[PDB]
């Protein structure tokens with residue numbers, strides 16, 4: 001595609017356990033209010049700790065003050081600022097419906113892939129959730145239209161990312177690889193079929209608690 | 219353990235696809251002589267390419283002349299030189315029985331975990347394979363006795379590494395993370411149970427075709 005560089009990029013940016021899980025076993029709606037179940041809360045906390053320690057996110061999410069202010073924080077600023085639309089699945093959405101503040105932390109249109117017929121959900125702070133029932137290509141078409149000159153983030157979870165991977169639609173795959181082993185949960189790289197996606201390493205940013213890997217489609 | 223630094227370290231050093239596989243589907247003895255089956259040979263090649271292009275290994279394995287000569291090369295040299303004994307499983311052994319040169323590339327005692335009651339197999343160049351039938355703790359006891367002041371490498375494959383992980387016996391875990399997606403095969407991080415291994419990141423060495431990760435036990 002000769003004009004690729006002028007097009008909005010479709011990217012994934014996630015935190016992954018060393019063993020390849022995006023969520024620990026027991027992190028489901030049934031146990032959402034009991035984080036001691038299979039110690040899921042502690043595993044989740046270990047996974048996200050790097051991010052929640054970045055000054056920029058701490059400010060943006062109103063978590064508190066202080067935080068780290070290096071290359072990783074600048075990276076996290078760019079991921080937020082570059083995004084014009086988000087795409088996610090229903091399990092991620094259900095978790096957030098209960099765990100996000102009223103001012104949802106997207107501030108863009110968000111396209112939720114679900115079989116449920118549901119009207120859009122407006123949140124203060126410039127987030128509207130749209131419930132898309134006709135699949136990932138249509139969600140992406142809507143998202144590209146909404147994103148303008150900015151990029152499209154496939155937020156997650158794994159089931160939705162797998163579909164975009166299988167469709168050949170992920171331009172950039174960014175992974176914070178964390179030195180925690182979950183032993184179970186939602187495996188990112190599962191249910192992939194041929195032709196499989198192909199990537200090269202574009203950049204690595206090492207840090208004491210996470211290795212930040214950036215892959216771009218071949 | 220106050221004396222830990224005087225004891226041989228038990229380490230894993232492997233190449234891993236981005237999706238967490240140590241071997242592609244199809245790489246079995248029935249298809250060992252048919253590398254086009256499920257494209258397994260090309261996938262295996264992609265996984266090991268970074269190491270076979272290093273000067274030190276090209277010379278040691280008599281693959282050919284020349285090669286890369288920076289930090290990655292120095293790293294591979296240290297991995298060979300540090301090792302006083304190897305532990306492996308039987309599927310790895312079988313592949314090697316057919317694919318290693320007569321002068322096997324270990325040059326130390328090698329303890330092969332297997333149900334087969336079998337006499338040792340001596341190879342030119344200082345390698346002897348011993349077939350251990352009473353489990354990974356005994357193989358490690360024998361390997362430690364063999365290793366002297368040098369380290370003990372758990373060569374692989376995934377099944378044997380999983381046992382040592384689950385036993386809490388892996389001191390160091392070194393992974394060349396390769397930007398290839400296999401979509402199946404022998405998953406490294408599978409069959410793990412609590413209490414799960416706990417690691418910290420010790421070092422990352424980035425290269426254009428592989429990201430070299432080193433984890434040490436907490």
Ligand SMILES: NC(=O)C1=CN([C@@H]2O[C@H](COP(=O)(O)OP(=O)(O)OC[C@H]3O[C@@H](n4cnc5c(N)ncnc54)[C@H](OP(=O)(O)O)[C@@H]3O)[C@@H](O)[C@H]2O)C=CC1
Pocket residue numbers: 013014015016021022023027047088089090091092093095113114115116133134135136155156157158159160161186
């Ligand atoms: N580690 C990280 O960086 C992050 C982790 N997460 C975690 O990911 C987990 C959720 O991931 P996962 O379980 O894979 O679920 P997803 O969030 O991917 O949701 C999958 C569900 O969305 C709906 N759906 C997906 N695709 C379609 C489609 N094409 N048509 C209709 N419905 C569709 C279906 O539910 P339905 O049939 O009910 O509509 C499906 O079961 C959570 O635990 C969350 O915390 C999330 C983001 C980042």
Ligand SMILES: NC(=O)C1=CN([C@@H]2O[C@H](COP(=O)(O)OP(=O)(O)OC[C@H]3O[C@@H](n4cnc5c(N)ncnc54)[C@H](OP(=O)(O)O)[C@@H]3O)[C@@H](O)[C@H]2O)C=CC1
Pocket residue numbers: 231232233234239240241245265306307308309310311313331332333334351353354373374375376377378379381404
């Ligand atoms: N990517 C990489 O860096 C590397 C990849 N590899 C690859 O790994 C693959 C092999 O891995 P995998 O399939 O997991 O097999 P393993 O090499 O781990 O061998 C497993 C077999 O060893 C025997 N065994 C293991 N543990 C015991 C035990 N406690 N007691 C008795 N027997 C035992 C069993 O065979 P039995 O019952 O017949 O005795 C078992 O099926 C190969 O394709 C090889 O090329 C290997 C090394 C490095």
Ligand SMILES: [Cl-]
Pocket residue numbers: 090114115116
């Ligand atoms: Cl639903």
Ligand SMILES: [Cl-]
Pocket residue numbers: 131132133134
């Ligand atoms: Cl719809």
